[PDB]
Design an enzyme around this catalytic site. Structure first.
Site, PDB file in Angstrom:
ATOM      1  CE  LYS A  80     -14.412 -27.095 -19.797  1.00 55.42           C
ATOM      2  NZ  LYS A  80     -15.870 -27.019 -20.088  1.00 55.42           N
TER       3      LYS A  80
HETATM    4  N1  FNU Z   1     -14.878 -23.586 -14.986  1.00 55.05           N
HETATM    5  C1  FNU Z   1     -15.112 -23.964 -13.721  1.00 55.05           C
HETATM    6  C2  FNU Z   1     -14.027 -24.211 -12.934  1.00 55.05           C
HETATM    7  F1  FNU Z   1     -12.753 -24.072 -13.432  1.00 55.05           F
HETATM    8  C3  FNU Z   1     -14.260 -24.623 -11.631  1.00 55.05           C
HETATM    9  O1  FNU Z   1     -13.276 -24.855 -10.764  1.00 55.05           O
HETATM   10  N2  FNU Z   1     -15.508 -24.724 -11.136  1.00 55.05           N
HETATM   11  C4  FNU Z   1     -16.526 -24.483 -11.996  1.00 55.05           C
HETATM   12  O2  FNU Z   1     -17.749 -24.577 -11.517  1.00 55.05           O
HETATM   13  N3  FNU Z   1     -16.382 -24.101 -13.264  1.00 55.05           N
HETATM   14  C5  FNU Z   1     -17.533 -23.843 -14.141  1.00 55.05           C
HETATM   15  O3  FNU Z   1     -18.242 -22.710 -13.635  1.00 55.05           O
HETATM   16  C6  FNU Z   1     -19.657 -22.935 -13.768  1.00 55.05           C
HETATM   17  C7  FNU Z   1     -20.274 -23.131 -12.389  1.00 55.05           C
HETATM   18  O4  FNU Z   1     -21.662 -22.879 -12.562  1.00 55.05           O
HETATM   19  P1  FNU Z   1     -22.737 -22.945 -11.348  1.00 55.05           P
HETATM   20  O5  FNU Z   1     -22.181 -23.935 -10.359  1.00 55.05           O
HETATM   21  O6  FNU Z   1     -23.995 -23.392 -12.060  1.00 55.05           O
HETATM   22  O7  FNU Z   1     -22.893 -21.555 -10.764  1.00 55.05           O
HETATM   23  C8  FNU Z   1     -19.803 -24.194 -14.606  1.00 55.05           C
HETATM   24  O8  FNU Z   1     -19.788 -23.793 -15.969  1.00 55.05           O
HETATM   25  C9  FNU Z   1     -18.563 -24.987 -14.234  1.00 55.05           C
HETATM   26  O9  FNU Z   1     -18.235 -25.934 -15.259  1.00 55.05           O
END
Ligand code: FNU
Ligand code: FNU
Lengths: 322, 327
Positions: free
Chosen positions: B145
């Site tokens: 990010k």
């Molecule tokens: N980068 C993300 C976004 F922009 C966003 O809007 N939502 C997210 O969840 N992530 C990432 O996506 C992953 C969600 O993982 P899980 O829930 O375990 O399946 C994590 O690394 C979150 O930080």
């Protein structure tokens, strides 16, 4: 224990400035320090070795205490670690008496892999020993479950006093950055409001919500969240990053949010106007207008005098405003 | 017509992998402290079955950091290498997930936040994870990010694309779109890189800026998507087999439909299935593209916190593929 709000006020009383020294060493800076030290019989490293709190850093201290010519022949794989860490200690030793706070931008410590994170940890240890307030500029942003990891890194591992945060994803992330429910701990942050990017207007000014520009909406929503969290009751705060080169917005923010904390980068390397920035963001509690100077000190070959100049000019401007 | 691994742009690497395994599953590898501890405890109780399997794999010999330690017998770590125990079990947990699940993965996404909270040790793990994935030739995303001014963001470009050799990363362009010139392009080396910019996120209050802010009759998320594509065009990324795509949350059905409707050929990365309870059928329906590397569905915890990650990954692979078929 103290709380960042109190740490800043007390150090401000002791050193009477709002200078924030940025420590963002790049690869050329490290190389140049190594080359110069090798050519001046390591004068600055020898000076570093005489300071007491070098004896209290956590990581590879016995490497850091070795003489430079022994590092080069006996611990060559630690050469880069050693010179990078000593460059940081040199800048801190030369300039700390002029600094209300130091801000370390995480981006400069990561690009070599783990080695720069050891340096970063030692830098935070060293500043903590010196009781100098710290800011980790990491511009963190994620969902709640993920950002708890940055809270741990920043506030438990580095034991930083504060950090920067980009709340564009949402304001609720701050509940898992500025507050640890299980430990009942509170931490401070500066959220991005108006940045120094030449195209910062695209989203920060050109978007709006019922006749207020995006940056005002974001600032207000950050303060709303500080309120929800009761930070200021726990001697912590959520403040704003407002670029030095953004005079109109600085003027607006200080007028509209009279008692907010502002961190203002952009003077020196990015050509912001110090007098104008400090005057537009002025508060009598001038820890509320931190003036960050990075490269104009760290890429100055005479960094003590560079920091002294900024300290003295800030002093003269603070007097004019008072 | 043939090229070695590492010698093709991300656009082509994704297409080829999609043609090989016929899915859009992106496996997220976000190991938390509990996961590492539980792996260590389970391996200790079962004579390190999974670690011994990791040690059989050819490419473990090709990773950069502390191979001497990584290749030790696990009981010698516990008894003789106490200060390396956490490094060893953290790194082996990651290898184990990759070994168990890679056959179903179009891409792996590693979120940087999980690799930093112990200091340098997790960054050594992260580097080895990327080196291992590079040797397996599986498309990678570093979810960091990133956002800063141009001079500072060059450092993230170096970390992500030179040091880790990632294929792509996530970027927050709120500070200004021009940061992309110093992320997706290196003017010194004349190299191009891919990124996914944040468009609509899965946090519950994501509307507070992404939908509430607007310019005339377009919401912030649409404006940000358009700006990112305008920059992709300026930088000539797709010509050079790279791209700028969009992060659109699984739970954001209307926005997903808007994005796929108004930007028909865009690349979307969609987290939020599993742990965050997004609707998989709705997400895939709205985000569908016949080249389904353009609708990556990220699943992290629902695979990595399952005691049988190979089977959990297979189940999601099959579920996704069944939904793709009915599109
Ligand atoms: N980068 C993300 C976004 F922009 C966003 O809007 N939502 C997210 O969840 N992530 C990432 O996506 C992953 C969600 O993982 P899980 O829930 O375990 O399946 C994590 O690394 C979150 O930080
Ligand atoms: N965090 C920042 C902002 F939100 C912003 O709008 N502008 C910035 O410059 N920084 C950081 O502030 C520092 C500016 O450093 P110097 O120019 O060398 O004096 C760098 O760490 C920048 O990344």
């Amino acid at each position: 224990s103290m709380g960042f709000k109190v740490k800043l006020e007390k150090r401000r009383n002791a050193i009477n400035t709002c200078l924030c020294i940025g420590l963002d060493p790049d690869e050329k800076d490290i190389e140049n320090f190594m080359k110069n030290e090798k050519e001046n019989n390591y004068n600055n490293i020898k000076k570093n070795l005489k300071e007491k709190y070098i004896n209290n850093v956590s990581i590879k201290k016995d490497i850091l205490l070795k003489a430079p010519d022994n590092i080069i022949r006996e611990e060559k794989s630690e050469e880069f670690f050693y010179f990078f860490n000593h460059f940081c200690f040199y800048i801190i030793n030369e300039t700390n008496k002029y600094a209300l706070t130091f801000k370390m931008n995480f981006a400069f410590y990561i690009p070599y892999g783990s080695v720069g994170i050891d340096v970063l940890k030692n830098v935070f240890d060293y500043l903590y020993e010196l009781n100098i307030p710290t800011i980790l500029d990491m511009k963190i942003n994620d969902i709640g479950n993920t950002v708890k990891n940055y809270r741990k890194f920043i506030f438990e591992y580095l034991k930083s006093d504060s950090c920067t945060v980009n709340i564009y994803m949402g304001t609720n992330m701050l509940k898992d950055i500025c507050y640890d429910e299980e430990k009942n701990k509170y931490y401070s942050a500066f959220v991005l409001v108006k940045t120094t990017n030449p195209d910062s207007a695209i989203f920060q000014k050109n978007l709006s919500l019922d006749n207020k520009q995006a940056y005002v909406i974001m600032a207000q929503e950050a303060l709303n969240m500080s309120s929800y969290l009761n930070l200021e009751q726990n001697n912590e705060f959520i403040g704003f990053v407002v670029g030095a080169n953004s005079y109109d917005e600085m003027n607006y923010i200080r007028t509209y949010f009279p008692n907010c904390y502002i961190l203002s980068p952009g003077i020196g390397a990015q050509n912001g106007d110090l007098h104008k920035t400090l005057t537009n963001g002025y508060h009598k509690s001038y820890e509320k207008i931190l003036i960050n100077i990075g490269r104009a000190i760290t890429k100055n070959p005479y960094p003590q005098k560079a920091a002294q100049m900024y300290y003295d000019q800030i002093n003269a401007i603070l007097k004019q405003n008072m």
